[PDB]
Amino acid sequence: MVIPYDYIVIGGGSAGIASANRAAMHGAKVLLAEGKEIGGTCVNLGCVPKKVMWYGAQVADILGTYAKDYGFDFKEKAFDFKQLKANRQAYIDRIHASYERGFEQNGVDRIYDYAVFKDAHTVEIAGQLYTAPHILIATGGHPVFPDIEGAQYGISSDGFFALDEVPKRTAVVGAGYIAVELAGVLHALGSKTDLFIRHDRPLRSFDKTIVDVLVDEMAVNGPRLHTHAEVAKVVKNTDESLTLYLKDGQEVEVDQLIWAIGRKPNLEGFSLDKTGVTLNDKGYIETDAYENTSVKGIYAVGDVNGKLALTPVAVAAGRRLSERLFNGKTDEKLDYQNVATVIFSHPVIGSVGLSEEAAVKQYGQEAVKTYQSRFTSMFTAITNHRQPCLMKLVTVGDTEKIVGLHGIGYGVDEMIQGFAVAIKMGATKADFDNTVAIHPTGSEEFVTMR
């Protein structure tokens, strides 16, 4: 006895929930399987708790650094990490309850268990067979641990959310946005923080002028950056502390070691090999522009397809797929070009489009012209801890089309979304120049460069 559905979604993360709900909105009978907690990485171990801890860091900077220069004094300051975590978990628990009510309203069927393939169009969940002509693999990814002696004494970003107290000393190893974000939060919350990168600078894919501001501010306040660093081994002393040994002979003793050296897709444990789905050279599920796998009736959306590991990409791709399969939108698909990103570093980095380096590689040096503005954020300008801001435009051709917009500085996290619309619409430097500024804001520096 096999139970039929119009759509089976494997994974209740950003990709699965979005695609499941949109499919249900268009009359499809949908089954969603989730082996862990609803909301996947974004809600339980990613964007959401990361942002809550980042706001905790912004409050920590107000109390320990800026409040004094605004005339506010106090004493017996104390920090209760368990209270911030309990409030963080209560908020996530309300997001879980909200998704469930949504499923009760739209009629999505959910099974909180592991889905395993039997063949290309049939899955087994809790000893019951389910079949559908449309199956979405939305299994996400997982953190990677290096093949280094003692690597098991360290934790990943999952481990960061399991901490119950600020470590006195923390080592963060990695050079991507997660390494930089977690290092900044631990530093703001009072941990002696050391960040280790293997090459010359962090965030290698982001505009160098922007990252250089971040590196300089880290050297003034932030975590201690160690460049050209390779961990040789990690030893756990009998006193429970960890000793990191670098290939160059240096060593650092810490209380916690966070590995943020990459993520890999969840491809094993669910008989993916019984479907015939093929992987690309990168090791992700191979898909076309419409998220079709190599097998008809099987789609792959989110981190598991390796295109862009961002929640809004997974959400939009999943909704556009449901539109295509169940609302007759044959040509519906996501444009993965010019997707804006915000890194909750200290200060915050916002970016959309090409770095100067990427524009030069795609259009040639003569065609590229950049505009930039450096200034101190008014918020920090009245204090003894002045923080720089840098906003940059990357333009190409005689009409100076804006192919990239990047910023670093206080409040940049909320500035990018509107500009990402203008760039999607083909904005030129003349469109920016014809827009009247909003004063006083940091965002106005984007439209007043000459």
Ligand X SMILES: Cc1cc2nc3c(=O)[nH]c(=O)nc-3n(C[C@H](O)[C@H](O)[C@H](O)CO)c2cc1C
Site for Cl ion in 301-360 (CB under 5 A): 355-357
* CA-closest candidate to residue 156, choices 175, 173, 138, 181: 173
Tell me whether residue 204 is exposed, middle or buried, using C-beta atoms within 10 angstroms of its C-beta: 0 to 12, 13 to 18, 19 or more: middle
Which token pair is 169? 């000393």
Residue 433, annotated ligand binder? no
Under the binding rule (CB under 8 A), the answer on residue 378 touching its own copies is yes
Tell me whether residue 173 is exposed, middle or buried, using C-beta atoms within 10 angstroms of its C-beta: 0 to 12, 13 to 18, 19 or more: buried
Among 12, 35, 46, 56, which residue sits at the site for ligand X (rule: CB under 6 A)?
Answer: 35
Whose CB is nearest to Cl ion? 159
- Of all helices (H) and strands (E), which one includes residue 360? helix 356-363
The rounded distance, in Å, linking the Cα atoms of 101 and 107 is 10
- Residue 375 interacts, among its own copies, ligand X, ligand FAD, none and using kind-specific CB cut-offs from 5 to 8 Å, with none
Judged by beta carbon, residue 92 or residue 120, the one nearer its own copies is 92
Judged by beta carbon, residue 109 or residue 431, the one nearer its own copies is 431
Tell me whether residue 386 is exposed, middle or buried, using C-beta atoms within 10 angstroms of its C-beta: 0 to 12, 13 to 18, 19 or more: exposed
Under the binding rule (CB under 6 A), the answer on residue 39 touching ligand X is no
Contact region for its own copies (CB under 8 A) — 110-118, 120-128, 289-297, 438-446? 438-446
Judged by beta carbon, residue 115 or residue 315, the one nearer Cl ion is 315
* CA-closest candidate to residue 37, choices 19, 22, 51, 16: 16
Site for ligand X in 102-141 (CB under 6 A): 114
Contact region for its own copies (CB under 8 A) — 65-73, 261-269, 295-303, 392-400? 65-73
Which token pair is 10? 């494997």
The rounded distance, in Å, linking the Cα atoms of 135 and 328 is 17
Q: Smallest distance, Å, CB 93 to its own copies?
A: 11
The rounded distance, in Å, linking the Cα atoms of 416 and 387 is 19
Under the binding rule (CB under 8 A), the answer on residue 294 touching its own copies is no
Tell me whether residue 436 is exposed, middle or buried, using C-beta atoms within 10 angstroms of its C-beta: 0 to 12, 13 to 18, 19 or more: exposed
Residue 42, annotated ligand binder? yes
Coil vs helix vs strand at 165: coil
Coil vs helix vs strand at 411: coil
Residue 41, annotated ligand binder? yes
Under the binding rule (CB under 6 A), the answer on residue 198 touching ligand X is no
Under the binding rule (CB under 8 A), the answer on residue 126 touching its own copies is no
- Cβ-proximal residues to 83 (8 Å cutoff; 6+ apart), any chain: none
Residue 437, annotated ligand binder? no
Q: Smallest distance, Å, CB 91 to ligand X?
A: 23
- Residue 172 interacts, among ligand FAD, its own copies, Cl ion, none and using kind-specific CB cut-offs from 5 to 8 Å, with none
Whether the Cβ atoms of residue 417 and residue 342 lie closer than 8 Å to each other: no
∠ Cα 189 385 64 (to 5°): 30
Residue 50, annotated ligand binder? yes
Among 28, 60, 140, 150, which residue sits at the site for ligand FAD (rule: CB under 6 A)?
Answer: 140
The rounded distance, in Å, linking the Cα atoms of 449 and 433 is 8
Which token pair is 175? 């050079």
Q: Smallest distance, Å, CB 428 to Cl ion?
A: 21
- Residue 419 interacts, among its own copies, Cl ion, ligand X, none and using kind-specific CB cut-offs from 5 to 8 Å, with its own copies
Judged by beta carbon, residue 191 or residue 275, the one nearer Cl ion is 191
Under the binding rule (CB under 5 A), the answer on residue 159 touching Cl ion is yes
- Please confirm, yes or no, whether 439 is among the known catalytic residues: yes
- Residue 176 interacts, among ligand X, Cl ion, its own copies, none and using kind-specific CB cut-offs from 5 to 8 Å, with Cl ion
Site for ligand FAD in 348-367 (CB under 6 A): none
Site for ligand X in 243-302 (CB under 6 A): 266, 268-269
Which residue blocks in 247-328 are alpha helix, DSSP H?
Answer: 311-326
Whether the Cβ atoms of residue 271 and residue 116 lie closer than 8 Å to each other: yes
Residue 266, annotated ligand binder? yes
Residue 247, annotated ligand binder? no
DSSP code of residue 150: T
- Cβ-proximal residues to 222 (8 Å cutoff; 6+ apart), any chain: 183, 184, 187, 193, 346
Under the binding rule (CB under 8 A), the answer on residue 438 touching its own copies is yes
Instruction: Pick out the residues of the known binding site.
Output: 14-15, 34-36, 41-42, 47, 50-51, 115, 174-181, 262, 266, 303, 311, 439
Q: Hey, which residues are catalytic here?
A: 439
Q: Give the binding site for ligand FAD (CB under 6 A).
A: 10-16, 33-36, 40-42, 45-47, 50, 114-115, 138-140, 157, 178, 266, 270, 302-303, 309-312, 314, 439
Interface residue list for ligand X (CB under 6 A): 35-36, 114, 142, 266, 268-269
Q: Residues comprising the binding site for riboflavin?
A: 35-36, 266
